Design a protein around this ligand. Structure first.
Ligand SMILES: [Mg+2]
Ligand SMILES: [Mg+2]
Ligand SMILES: [Mg+2]
Ligand SMILES: [Mg+2]
Ligand SMILES: [Mg+2]
Ligand SMILES: [Mg+2]
Ligand SMILES: [Mg+2]
Ligand SMILES: [Mg+2]
Ligand SMILES: [Mg+2]
Ligand SMILES: [Mg+2]
Ligand SMILES: [Mg+2]
Ligand SMILES: [Mg+2]
Ligand SMILES: [Mg+2]
Ligand SMILES: [Mg+2]
Ligand SMILES: [Mg+2]
Ligand SMILES: [Mg+2]
Ligand SMILES: [Mg+2]
Ligand SMILES: [Mg+2]
Ligand SMILES: [Mg+2]
Ligand SMILES: [Mg+2]
Ligand SMILES: [Mg+2]
Ligand SMILES: [Mg+2]
Ligand SMILES: [Mg+2]
Ligand SMILES: [Mg+2]
Ligand SMILES: [Mg+2]
Ligand SMILES: [Mg+2]
Ligand SMILES: [Mg+2]
Ligand SMILES: [Mg+2]
Ligand SMILES: [Mg+2]
Ligand SMILES: [Mg+2]
Ligand SMILES: [Mg+2]
Ligand SMILES: [Mg+2]
Ligand SMILES: [Mg+2]
Ligand SMILES: [Mg+2]
Ligand SMILES: [Mg+2]
Ligand SMILES: [Mg+2]
Ligand SMILES: [Mg+2]
Lengths: 386, 6, 136, 63
RNA sequence: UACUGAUAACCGCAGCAGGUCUCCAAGGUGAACAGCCUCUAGUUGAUAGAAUAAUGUAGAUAAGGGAAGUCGGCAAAAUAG
RNA sequence: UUAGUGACGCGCAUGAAUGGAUUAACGAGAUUCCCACUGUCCCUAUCUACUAUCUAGCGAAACCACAGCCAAGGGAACGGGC
RNA sequence: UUGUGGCAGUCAAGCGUUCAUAGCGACAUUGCUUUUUGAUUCUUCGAUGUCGGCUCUUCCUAUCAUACCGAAGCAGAAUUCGGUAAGCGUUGGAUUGUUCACCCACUAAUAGGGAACGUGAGCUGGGUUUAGACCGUCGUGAGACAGGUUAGUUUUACCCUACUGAUGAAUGUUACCGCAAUAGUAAUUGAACUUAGUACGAGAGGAACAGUUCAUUCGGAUAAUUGGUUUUUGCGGCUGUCUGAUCAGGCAUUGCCGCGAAGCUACCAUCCGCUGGAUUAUGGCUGAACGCCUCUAAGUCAGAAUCCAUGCUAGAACGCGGUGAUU
């Protein structure tokens, strides 16, 4: 018979199977459509999520009740040390998809990146790219003809970059390596850009700019095996339920004599790869700079890092991206920042954002202070002091 | 022993 | 909101599900108001319609004048007592739940309001704003 | 933006931090934390709480 | 005429959380052989180790509302000398 | 408010030790409302111990024609087999 | 099977100021359905766990609302009829065990149904329908009563399959970067301001497109802040007892109380939720058939919450590629 009262499906079926991601680094399953007119640039970047903090800014939204008034907003910080370009590979179109024909690498690969090709680095002759590097040193023979092959073919071109993990406080020592598409023009110019940038570094200022909308692609926080209640948001059965209330009561009708795929079942929660779109950049900050956390209105020389450091991460001694709101992933997780795929005007993606203040108080508690000088002024001399 | 089918 | 609601209201946390008795802040002769409905409320299985500061609810009078009791009438919430976030970032709350009696287009039946009112309700109902002394 | 002062402790309140309590007499009490809010609700006096600015003033500590 | 007199000597198919008559009875708190702690005396027995997912059993806490839940205030809370 | 209470009564088929009508006190009896109280609920979340889990040792039972992917058809008119 | 129930047609005497068909439609007649109730007794009596509710999923369309349209006895506003459409939604409560019903209220709307009259090794057990007991009526009596009342044990999964997640041999080894067949897919609805007291209308009344700001339901994340949680048994305090006192502590099955970081977490907190093509209905172009006319027959334009892609989620463990090192 028919359901007594209507209600919607608990959960989204296009986010199935709610399984563990195949890797910890989510992969970009789509890059922005290429305009073969603009200069050569990366469509994405690699960074590590540090944490979240608090922002004040004056809103410019004509029609709202908070126009030209101060609002408080949550931002997330992504430590973005400059990536290092080691390699390109060309993709050509086929009736079975895009297919890579060649991958050209740089001559000198750094240890942190050739650690990505080992599961046991402490016991190895390290023997990686030791013949490919001797493929150089005869002027360009085995390399320039591969690049010319990529030029003659390869409607799509992607650069291999790796992270400078040693510049972060993470104790991982193993760089993340990724393919990032180039969306300039003239595949010859694409690959010449790559060749010139081999062994060289690319900063986030050359890729992202302020008030720009981006997508964050990351594997989300893991929570292990979870029951249907928190996994799907189903109703708790009442108190006097024998053999458990934290369940789904009916998991199907008699016919079809099967459990359907659309029925809420217990299982893995978290560690899914997620793409979250339209997160505005509120600041692109440099690491060759103090007063990273200063504004036009505060003007007190303080870095972006809170007192005591970002909890479970550390400092932001390198460059960073302050992006509005909440992005998938937890602290210390590799995040892939991607340019938007469509032009969103929207009267909200075009708002020019001018920050007024940045919270640099401790996140290890109820922080009263933003700076140790402020702490010292408020509290006075202590028994530790002289 | 259920006295129900009655 | 609705008929006499001049403007829009940013969301603020709901505290007053149907069944809630809140004090009456005006001088119409009613002491409390028993909420039986909320205007502008959605429909979800088992979800109780709940009201916040600024909402126009349907209410009865349980304690007060007999000519007001035993009948349904519109009311407006002016104090919540559950914390809600302003876009200024501050969370704020009163100590009691409080409403006033009104007509479906927002004109207050009484002439005064005892205690403070929320600026969110004052901006949404001008007859409330006129008869309100302190607005926070 | 303005930096406010805790009505109980005297601590500075930066934006988005703490709570605000409007009392029936229309008075506004700003709290930096649930600690001071809870002591207020427990009806404690700040002049007898040893970490409050008012205690330290009344006792001449760092004056 | 020894010995047990019972979470192992009795009866329950058994070294079963059941049942099975009675005597003696310290200090403190406190109305109190109540509950809680301790002295004398007696035990330290019950398969263990490593982890801390779901669902459970037992115990609990929860903003604002306050029986709108349910056949029904079932359960729990509140009260308590 | 198909509930409850108070009244009405041509009462299918009330009624007098088949006891009738009352009734203070009493009731782990059946019931309605009110105050208070609360995670019963809005709407869920979190913590603890013992489990489940993995290991060493020990080691059953129910049940069992053969066995175990589905749709339709027909068919003892709802098949795992056709 | 379909009498009965429900739904839909044909015809057109009439109603509708005039006027059969805007909307209705008698006398008659053709059918569909199987959510009614019956008829039947094919299966099941070496047992297929019956009412209802709670919970959860899917499906149908005979569409209540939402999108797009056609018609009117459509001036506007509101309403009625109809079409393509099941993509998305369809509530909270008083009484009743109820299905059903009836009222209150919100709502864009409170549409109908199926899935062994879905769903009891999923719950509950209020009712029905063992045994106790009361009443009324019937009965000489024992006892009877789809008459009423009260009390009345809801067992087992560790197996196969399915489902959710999780490993994994073999494709020379091992490692890294990738492709993308197939499967799934998601966003939804409303108000306010303005348009505008404008169009329309004698007046009364009274819109709409674009645009802006917000909100409803849903979903996916997140924990800066607020709140919750507290074996941080972290700090402090309190009781009783014990360690001669002090200090410092033990026990009270986490002794109690306040605060309480971290972590987890809440529409109780915050952020986010894409744009292109092909089409339905319908309206049209040219244009014959039928020297005229005709959206249609050839051909074609625009067009929906529709479909397919973009995008998003997995990645075939017998689908594939490129690269590194290869004792
Ligand atoms: Mg339905
Ligand atoms: Mg049903
Ligand atoms: Mg969630
Ligand atoms: Mg039970
Ligand atoms: Mg913190
Ligand atoms: Mg319900
Ligand atoms: Mg002897
Ligand atoms: Mg002897
Ligand atoms: Mg003896
Ligand atoms: Mg004895
Ligand atoms: Mg003895
Ligand atoms: Mg024996
Ligand atoms: Mg015997
Ligand atoms: Mg005494
Ligand atoms: Mg004695
Ligand atoms: Mg005693
Ligand atoms: Mg044992
Ligand atoms: Mg109910
Ligand atoms: Mg009699
Ligand atoms: Mg079959
Ligand atoms: Mg069989
Ligand atoms: Mg055969
Ligand atoms: Mg029929
Ligand atoms: Mg018929
Ligand atoms: Mg039969
Ligand atoms: Mg039978
Ligand atoms: Mg059998
Ligand atoms: Mg069965
Ligand atoms: Mg249809
Ligand atoms: Mg049937
Ligand atoms: Mg079943
Ligand atoms: Mg009986
Ligand atoms: Mg007789
Ligand atoms: Mg009978
Ligand atoms: Mg807290
Ligand atoms: Mg916390
Ligand atoms: Mg023409």
């Amino acid at each position: 018979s028919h359901r007594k009262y209507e209600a919607p499906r608990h959960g989204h079926l296009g986010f199935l199977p709610r399984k563990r991601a195949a890797s910890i680094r989510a992969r970009v399953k789509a890059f922005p459509k290429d305009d073969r007119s603009k200069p050569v640039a990366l469509t994405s970047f690699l960074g590590y999520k540090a944490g979240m903090t608090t922002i004040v800014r004056d809103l410019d939204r004509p029609g709202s009740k908070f126009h030209k008034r101060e609002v408080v907003e949550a931002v997330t910080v992504v430590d973005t040390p400059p990536v290092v370009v080691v390699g390109v590979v060309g993709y050509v179109e086929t009736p079975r998809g895009l297919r890579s024909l060649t991958t050209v690498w740089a001559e000198h690969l750094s240890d942190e990146v050739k650690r990505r090709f080992y599961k046991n680095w402490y016991k190895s002759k390290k023997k990686a790219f030791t013949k490919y590097s001797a493929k150089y040193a005869q002027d360009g023979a085995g390399i320039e003809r591969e690049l010319a092959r990529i030029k003659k073919y390869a409607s799509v071109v992607r650069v291999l970059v790796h992270t400078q993990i040693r510049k972060t406080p993470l104790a991982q020592k193993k760089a993340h390596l990724a393919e990032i598409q180039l969306n300039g023009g003239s595949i010859s110019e694409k690959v010449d850009w790559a060749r010139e940038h081999f062994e060289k570094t690319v900063a986030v200022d050359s890729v992202f700019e302020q008030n720009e909308m981006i997508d964050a692609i990351a594997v989300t926080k893991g929570h292990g095996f979870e029951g249907v209640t928190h996994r799907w948001g189903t109703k708790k059965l009442p108190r006097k339920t024998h053999r458990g209330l934290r369940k789904v009561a009916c998991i199907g009708a008699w016919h079809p004599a099967h459990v359907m795929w659309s029925v809420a079942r217990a299982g893995q929660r978290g560690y899914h790869s997620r793409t979250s779109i339209n997160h505005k950049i509120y600041r692109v900050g440099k690491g060759d700079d103090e007063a990273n956390g200063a504004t036009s209105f505060d003007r007190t020389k303080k870095t972006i890092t809170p007192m005591g450091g970002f909890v479970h991460y550390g400092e932001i001694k390198n460059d960073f991206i302050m992006v509005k709101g909440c992005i998938p992933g937890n602290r210390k997780r590799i995040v892939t920042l991607r340019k938007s795929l469509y032009t969103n005007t929207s009267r909200k993606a075009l708002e020019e954002v001018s920050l007024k203040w940045i919270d640099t108080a401790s996140k290890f508690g109820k922080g009263r202070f933003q700076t140790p000088a402020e702490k010292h002024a408020f509290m006075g001399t202590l028994k530790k002091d002289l | 022993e259920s006295w129900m089918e009655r | 909101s609705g008929n006499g609601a001049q403007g829009t209201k940013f969301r603020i946390s709901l505290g007053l599900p149907v069944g809630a008795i809140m004090n009456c802040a005006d001088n119409s002769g009613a002491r409390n108001l028993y909420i039986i409905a909320v205007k502008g409320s959605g429909s979800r299985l088992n979800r109780l319609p709940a009201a916040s500061l600024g909402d126009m609810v349907m209410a009865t009078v349980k304690k007060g004048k007999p000519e007001l009791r035993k009948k349904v009438m519109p009311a407006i919430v002016v104090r919540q007592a559950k914390s809600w976030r302003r876009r200024d970032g501050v969370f704020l709350y009163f100590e009691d739940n409080a409403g006033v009696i009104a007509n479906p287009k927002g004109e207050m039946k009484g002439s005064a309001i005892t205690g403070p009112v929320g600026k969110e309700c004052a901006d949404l109902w001008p007859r409330v704003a006129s008869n309100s002394g302190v607005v926070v | 933006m303005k930096v406010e002062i805790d009505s109980f402790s005297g601590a500075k309140i930066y934006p988005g931090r703490g709570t605000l309590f409007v009392r029936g007499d229309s008075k506004i009490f700003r709290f930096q934390n649930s600690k001071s809010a809870s002591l207020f609700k427990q009806r404690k006096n700040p002049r007898r709480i040893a970490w409050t600015v008012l205690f330290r003033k009344h006792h001449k500590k760092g004056i």
